[PDB]
Amino acid sequence: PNWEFARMIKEFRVTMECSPLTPIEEHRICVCVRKRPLNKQELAKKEIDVISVPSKCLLLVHEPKLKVDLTKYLENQAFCFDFAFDETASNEVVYRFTARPLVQTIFEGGKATCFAYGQTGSGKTHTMGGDQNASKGIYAMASRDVFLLKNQPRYRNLNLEVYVTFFEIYNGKVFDLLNKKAKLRVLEDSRQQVQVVGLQEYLVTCADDVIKMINMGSACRTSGNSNSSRSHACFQILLRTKGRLHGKFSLVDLAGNERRQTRMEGAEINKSLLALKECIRALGQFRESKLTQVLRDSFIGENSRTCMIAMISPGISSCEYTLNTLRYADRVKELSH
Numbered sequence: 001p002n003w004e005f006a007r008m009i010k011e012f013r014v015t016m017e018c019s020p021l022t023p024i025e026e027h028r029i030c031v032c033v034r035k036r037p038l039n040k041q042e043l044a045k046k047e048i049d050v051i052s053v054p055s056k057c058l059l060l061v062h063e064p065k066l067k068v069d070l071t072k073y074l075e076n077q078a079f080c081f082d083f084a085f086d087e088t089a090s091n092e093v094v095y096r097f098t099a100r101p102l103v104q105t106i107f108e109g110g111k112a113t114c115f116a117y118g119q120t121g122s123g124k125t126h127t128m129g130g131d132q133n134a135s136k137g138i139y140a141m142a143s144r145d146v147f148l149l150k151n152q153p154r155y156r157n158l159n160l161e162v163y164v165t166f167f168e169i170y171n172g173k174v175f176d177l178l179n180k181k182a183k184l185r186v187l188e189d190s191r192q193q194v195q196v197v198g199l200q201e202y203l204v205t206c207a208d209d210v211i212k213m214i215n216m217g218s219a220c221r222t223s224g225n226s227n228s229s230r231s232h233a234c235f236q237i238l239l240r241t242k243g244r245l246h247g248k249f250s251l252v253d254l255a256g257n258e259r260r261q262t263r264m265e266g267a268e269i270n271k272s273l274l275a276l277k278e279c280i281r282a283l284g285q286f287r288e289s290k291l292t293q294v295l296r297d298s299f300i301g302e303n304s305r306t307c308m309i310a311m312i313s314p315g316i317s318s319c320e321y322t323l324n325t326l327r328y329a330d331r332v333k334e335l336s337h
């Protein structure tokens with residue numbers, strides 16, 4: 001009869017109680033939304049907070065609406081996600097239920113990828129790079145735990161070495177942020193696999209190391225506006241035991257999703273995001289793009305997980321961008337079903 005509506009509802013319930021242990025089931029895909037709090041500006045123009053997250057996996061959007069006759073009312077729309085962080089959640093907290101549970105996956109010899117997605121000024125970079133910033137952001141934290149996991153009994157007889165790469169994608173091709181924005185070439189041989197020629201891998205033996213690389217890169221990404229907010233940032237943690245690659249973790253700081261003549265470039269951002277969504281969806285089982293081309297191998301393997309973190313500015317003034325972001329997340333999530 002209406003099984004299609006039934007399934008989507010069941011789905012909504014299954015996710016609505018949410019046992020954070022969601023564990024050794026098989027969860028290749030993780031979707032989490034995160035409301036930031038209102039900043040100073042927004043508070044000064046006395047902007048309205050239209051987001052509420054009453055439970056750990058239920059976000060509500062109090063979108064404002066006018067009746068044809070000008071009457072005011074609210075369309076309290078409710079969404080659900082594996083995990084729903086409020087404005088009080090610190091990075092570490094967010095990091096714990098998102099990026100953390102994936103580290104192990106690179107050690108088990110898998111490939112992981114965590115994505116920061118949302119409108120511009122929502123939080124993506126503040127979450128990935130750090131609130132100067134680094135060391136508090138997910139790149140750092142994730143690094144920290146990669147070492148703590150390497151000198152581990154179980155992972156000691158592995159003899160692995162830790163490597164890190166930092167690059168940005170902006171309108172076609174790649175630019176290494178660790179080799180002075182040196183533009184790089186992307187090739188695809190005659191079987192499925194892509195390769196970014198010239199990407200610089202830096203050996204790291206300490207969290208303080210990876211934090212140096214992070215500052216350097218972020219330094220060559222925000223100095224020279226609002227471009228950073230129009231490029232894809234991608235930090236990689238790689239594990240080699242000499243020979244091939246053991247495991248790989250791709251942390252990606254996406255460009256505004258809310259994105260004339262040259263501004264038409266937003267079409268490249270939108271193709272990528274549409275590409276991403278389909279690759280991710282392919283995982284739980286389409287007009288290529290640079291981004292999804294570079295991270296191709298991290299979606300095709302069977303031993304590969306990924307966590308999407310949808311950032312959200314709570315201001316009423318961003319309501320329509322919020323809804324956009326949520327909607328996009330919704331489709332990413334119901335990929336596990």
Ligand SMILES: Nc1ncnc2c1ncn2[C@@H]1O[C@H](COP(=O)(O)OP(=O)(O)O)[C@@H](O)[C@H]1O
Binds near residue numbers: 036039127
């Ligand atoms: N949870 C948070 N706690 C404190 N400051 C935050 C938080 N999230 C975002 N911010 C602040 O908000 C701004 C927007 O984030 P970034 O600047 O992360 O934007 P975007 O989502 O465009 O990458 C930054 O000034 C950052 O310091």
Ligand SMILES: [Mg+2]
Binds near residue numbers: 121229
């Ligand atoms: Mg940003």
